[PDB]
Write a protein that binds this ligand. Structure first.
Ligand SMILES: Nc1ncnc2c1ncn2[C@@H]1O[C@H](COP(=O)(O)OP(=O)(O)O)[C@@H](O)[C@H]1O
Ligand SMILES: [Mg+2]
Length: 734
């Protein structure tokens, strides 16, 4: 609805054309959904039923014959284009896709699907962000207000006013669906400190994004923003925190992927001062840390991004000397991919050869080149009360220097985030902040690897949290009504994958113990995985060979479906041997290295990327458990920028990954249809025209089976479909 408040003219969709559209001829007895060959979901009409095989005619026009068993029911035209699909009485997998595509063709960006708030990505200016709409949405609840994020924000505000507890808003979806723009509009709505957030956004987007296959500006890390509020419901301050940074991107790149945008921006020649002081040859192919990926791509101009980022750095809380120091640090990180470390003759010890790039790195950090080389080649460890040296060959020192590079990059990013936060806040008292989070969803490619596995595990944990919250809400409703229906927690329905991943003897534990084995390779890792899990656990299964994929080693049945991964490269990218003497050298530099490495018990060698990822995920989960969540799902309708055409398979895959259909099925598994007794008595009596006892007599006098309904005191539990049939026959009797 859009009347009485001057909303968007197309937002109404009521009392203007719905009356003349509900009479469209759509014979449900002959209209069904047929699986296509390209879009795999296309609507079609059946001329006649010829037994098992039925001829289907589609909108595009086809005369193929299709078996009758897989073609399934089609929604009535009268209930089509409904605002909320949560109470849809004909739940179908293509029903959601068709409703979303029709609404998007009608320019319905926001659609309610229960607790979820599906928001597609258009490419145009939307007048829905008018401050008049913001003022109108104030004081409105979920039901009365039209579908928009303002309704859920007002619900969270009311929860703060009455329940007096933390509320968190969660946004997830496929990378490139508009996470940054959506969260910018969200934080702007709570703003109406916003300018500080807008100016700080490019720095984080440049230091924590990389060009993936699907998206060129995907945010690998997770961003959490807390909006501190006062006692009287007024904005106090803001602080941000980042989680789950990917050191793998810093250390390794795929054949069709790029590193973080900072290195490529620095490689631009429009800022000769940085290149001059960093001793850079301006050729990305001269550095192994960057050249192994994609050198450069089109559809981007990193010069403008560098200008935006350094302009934000200049006019901010801090000065430019530390910006120069950060540029020096990133240049040194680029420089670490050049030493040779030739093995000594007749000995397993490793000695350096190219003592030129080492000198450059030492000058950049202010360290001693000889001391740095001695520390890298001959680390020193304290045994008992004395100190001894350790021998290290070329592979060990290579792993150590890679770990040092990724660790210093992560610490520099964390220090920058902390500095921006310390600039951001203001000294007003803070009470019961509001959290905003955005993390990429169930990303699935044809070459799934360790990073994809970590992202899938994080999203798996998030889905587990969402299911647990939904079960808690359902049980709270059951206790309110005093009757429990299917009181089985949904956490165990999903804990199988988490146990396969996180629990001991799982994939992560096996990889961690294989990293420390004397002579361990990837084939041995796969062999141990098969010996430990093939047949023991239902989730683990053999890989599949479909559509001519390159290669797969093992497959898991995730929450979104079957995913096949790849093994090669996991061992190299999981080892994180952090040298300690080099850290001690870092603590004595004449630079920001003291601030970055201020604090530095498991052993240094027994450190893995998986362990740090798991502990960070646990910290994020234990932080999020204390706040009441609010789930927002964002999807991209079209792979290109044209809103006119939207690909059906892509939307189907994204909907399956996001679990909106799964969520609505979980909601409808119980008794979601609840209505008030008096309203039922005074409205639905027209079903067969001629307080608790009167309502019971009325419902029992309408030829209704007693097993389908459940009587209560305030809210009556009704099975899905009963209310729809009751109301559709009531209209006929009018
Ligand atoms: N509500 C919106 N209206 C118009 N354009 C949008 C909207 N949301 C996202 N976009 C488009 O998305 C693009 C960037 O998406 P972004 O949020 O950077 O993706 P990612 O989350 O992968 O970084 C922008 O060019 C912008 O035009
Ligand atoms: Mg983003």
């Amino acid at each position: 609805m859009a009347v009485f408040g001057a909303a968007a003219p197309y937002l109404r969709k009521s009392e203007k054309e719905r009356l003349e559209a509900q009479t469209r001829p759509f014979d449900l007895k002959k209209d069904v959904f047929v699986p296509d060959d390209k879009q795999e979901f296309v609507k079609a009409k059946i001329v006649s039923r010829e037994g098992g095989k039925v001829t289907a005619e589609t909108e595009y026009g086809k005369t193929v014959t299709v078996k009758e068993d897989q073609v399934m029911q089609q929604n009535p035209p009268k209930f089509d284009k409904i605002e909320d699909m949560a109470m849809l009485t004909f739940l179908h997998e293509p029903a959601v896709l068709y409703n979303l595509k029709d609404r998007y063709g009608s320019w319905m960006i926001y659609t309610y699907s229960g607790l979820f708030c599906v928001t597609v990505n258009p490419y145009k200016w939307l007048p829905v962000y008018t401050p008049e709409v913001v003022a109108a949405y104030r004081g409105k609840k979920r039901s009365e207000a039209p579908p928009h994020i303002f309704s859920i924000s007002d619900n969270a505000y009311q929860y703060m006013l009455t329940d007096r507890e933390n509320q968190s808003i969660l946004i997830t979806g496929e990378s490139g669906a508009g996470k940054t723009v959506n969260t910018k509009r969200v934080i702007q709505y709570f703003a109406v400190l916003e300018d500080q957030i807008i100016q700080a956004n490019p720095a984080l987007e440049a230091f924590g994004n990389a060009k993936t296959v699907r998206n060129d500006n995907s945010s690998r890390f997770g961003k959490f923003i807390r909006i501190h509020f006062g006692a009287t419901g007024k904005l106090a301050s803001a602080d941000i925190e980042t989680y789950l940074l990917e050191k793998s991107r810093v250390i390794f790149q795929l054949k069709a992927e790029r590193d973080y945008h900072i290195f490529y921006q620095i490689l631009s020649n429009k800022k000769p001062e940085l290149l001059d002081m960093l001793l850079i040859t301006n050729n990305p192919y001269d550095y192994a840390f960057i050249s192994q990926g994609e050198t450069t791509v089109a559809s981007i101009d990193d010069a403008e991004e560098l200008m935006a980022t350094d302009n934000a750095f200049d006019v901010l809380g801090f000065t430019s000397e530390e910006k120069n120091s950060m540029y020096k640090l990133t240049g040194a990180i680029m420089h670490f991919g050049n030493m040779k470390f030739k093995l000594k003759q007749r000995e397993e010890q490793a000695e350096p050869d190219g003592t030129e790039e080492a000198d450059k790195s030492a000058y950049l950090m202010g360290l001693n080149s000889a001391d740095l080389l001695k520390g890298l080649c001959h680390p020193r460890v304290k045994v008992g009360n004395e100190y001894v040296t350790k021998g290290q060959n070329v592979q060990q020192v290579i792993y150590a220097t890679g770990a040092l590079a990724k660790a210093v990059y992560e610490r520099m990013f964390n220090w920058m985030v902390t500095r921006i936060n310390a600039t951001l806040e203001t000294k007003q008292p803070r009470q019961y902040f509001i959290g905003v989070l955005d993390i990429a969803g169930f990303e699935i490619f044809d070459f799934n690897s360790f990073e994809q596995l970590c992202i899938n595990f994080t999203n798996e944990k998030l889905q587990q949290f969402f299911n647990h919250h939904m079960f808690v809400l359902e049980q709270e409703e059951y206790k309110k009504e005093g009757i429990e229906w299917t009181f089985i927690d949904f956490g165990m329905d999903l804990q199988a994958c988490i146990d396969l991943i996180e629990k001991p003897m799982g994939i992560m534990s096996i990889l961690e113990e294989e990293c420390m084995f004397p002579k361990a390779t990837d084939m041995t890792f796969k062999a141990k995985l098969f010996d430990n899990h093939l047949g023991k656990s239902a989730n683990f299964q053999k890989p599949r060979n479909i559509k001519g994929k390159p290669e797969a080693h093992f497959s898991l049945i995730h929450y979104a479906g079957i995913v096949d991964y790849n093994i090669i490269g996991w061992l190299q990218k999981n080892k994180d041997p952090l040298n300690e003497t080099v850290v001690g050298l870092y603590q004595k530099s004449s630079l920001k290295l003291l601030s970055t490495l201020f604090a530095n018990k498991k052993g240094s060698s027994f450190q893995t990327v998986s362990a740090l990822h798991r502990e960070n995920l646990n910290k994020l989960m234990t932080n999020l458990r204390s706040t009441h969540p609010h789930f927002v799902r964002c999807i991209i309708p079209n792979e290109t920028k044209s809103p006119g055409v939207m690909d059906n398979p892509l939307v189907m895959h994204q909907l399956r990954c996001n679990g909106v259909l799964e969520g609505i099925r979980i909601c409808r598994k119980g008794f979601p249809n609840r209505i008030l007794y008096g309203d039922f008595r005074q409205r639905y009596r027209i079903l067969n025209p001629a307080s608790r006892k009167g309502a019971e007599k009325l419902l029992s006098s309408l030829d209704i089976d007693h097993n389908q309904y459940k009587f209560g005191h305030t809210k009556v539990f009704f099975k899905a479909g009963l209310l729809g049939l009751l109301e559709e026959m009531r209209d006929e009797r009018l």
